[PDB]
Amino acid sequence: ASRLYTLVLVLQPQRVLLGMKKRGFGAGRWNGFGGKVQEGETIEDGARRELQEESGLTVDALHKVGQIVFEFVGEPELMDVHVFCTDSIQGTPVESDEMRPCWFQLDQIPFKDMWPDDSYWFPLLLQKKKFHGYFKFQGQDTILDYTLREVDTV
Numbered sequence: 001a002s003r004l005y006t007l008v009l010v011l012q013p014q015r016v017l018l019g020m021k022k023r024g025f026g027a028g029r030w031n032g033f034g035g036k037v038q039e040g041e042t043i044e045d046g047a048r049r050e051l052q053e054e055s056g057l058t059v060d061a062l063h064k065v066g067q068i069v070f071e072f073v074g075e076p077e078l079m080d081v082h083v084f085c086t087d088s089i090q091g092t093p094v095e096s097d098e099m100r101p102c103w104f105q106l107d108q109i110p111f112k113d114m115w116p117d118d119s120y121w122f123p124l125l126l127q128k129k130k131f132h133g134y135f136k137f138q139g140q141d142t143i144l145d146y147t148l149r150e151v152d153t154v
Contacts, residue, residue, distance in 0.1 A: 002069065002080035004037035006047035008062065009085045009125060014106060017089075018114075019054060019099030026140075030114050032083075033099060047084050054099040058090045064154040065125055068117070068133040073144070082154075085125065116141065120148055130154045 009032045010017035018030040033054045037046035044062055051057055066083035093101035104110065106126060111119045117135045124131045129150045136145040 001076070002078040004043060004046070005079050005081045006034035006037060006043060006050055007032040007068075007081050007083045008034055008047050008051045008059075009065070009083070010051075010057070010087075010089055011085050011125065012087050015103045016106060016109065017055070017093060017101055017103055018110075019101045022096075022098055022100060024098070026115060028113075030102075030104075030110050031118075034081075037082075043082050044084070047082070054096050055101050056091055056094040056096070059086045060088045060090065062086050064130070065128075066121065066131045066133065067154055068121065068135065070117075071134075071136040071145075073136070073138045083125070116143055117146070120146065124148075124150065 019033055020030055021027050033051045034047060035050045037043050041049065047062055048059060051059065062084040063086065064082070065085045068081045068083060070079040070081065095101065109122065121131055121133050130152065132149055132151050134147045135143055138144050
């Protein structure tokens with residue numbers, strides 16, 4: 001058993017929007033926007049909801065760019081993360097209770113203050129390659145196992 005999550009990256013030609021997670025899981029790291037998919041919404045609709053709740057933004061179109069499965073040692077549910085991108089946003093990002101948004105130049109992405117798996121798969125998002133990733137963490141800092149590959153269909 002896995003649990004569905006979303007992650008949304010707003011990726012423009014020379015900049016990417018990230019949020020500093022203020023509370024809960026991953027607090028104190030920059031990440032894309034997202035969360036648990038709820039009952040009664042599609043995965044994409046949950047990604048839009050989470051982007052709106054966390055950043056205030058709405059989007060015309062979301063593109064599927066990846067799937068990453070996370071195992072956390074000692075947690076029974078795997079996280080099945082569906083990764084989306086958009087260039088097209090509507091509105092100005094604003095801070096929420098969960099996230100403080102900020103734009104980053106593509107050569108200044110703050111990997112040292114991001115989940116450690118991001119260093120591995122971001123290069124693929126930036127190159128516009130679709131991917132499937134798996135990472136096994138021991139706590140929040142150590143990757144014990146991982147796999148990563150490009151795919152044709154996400």
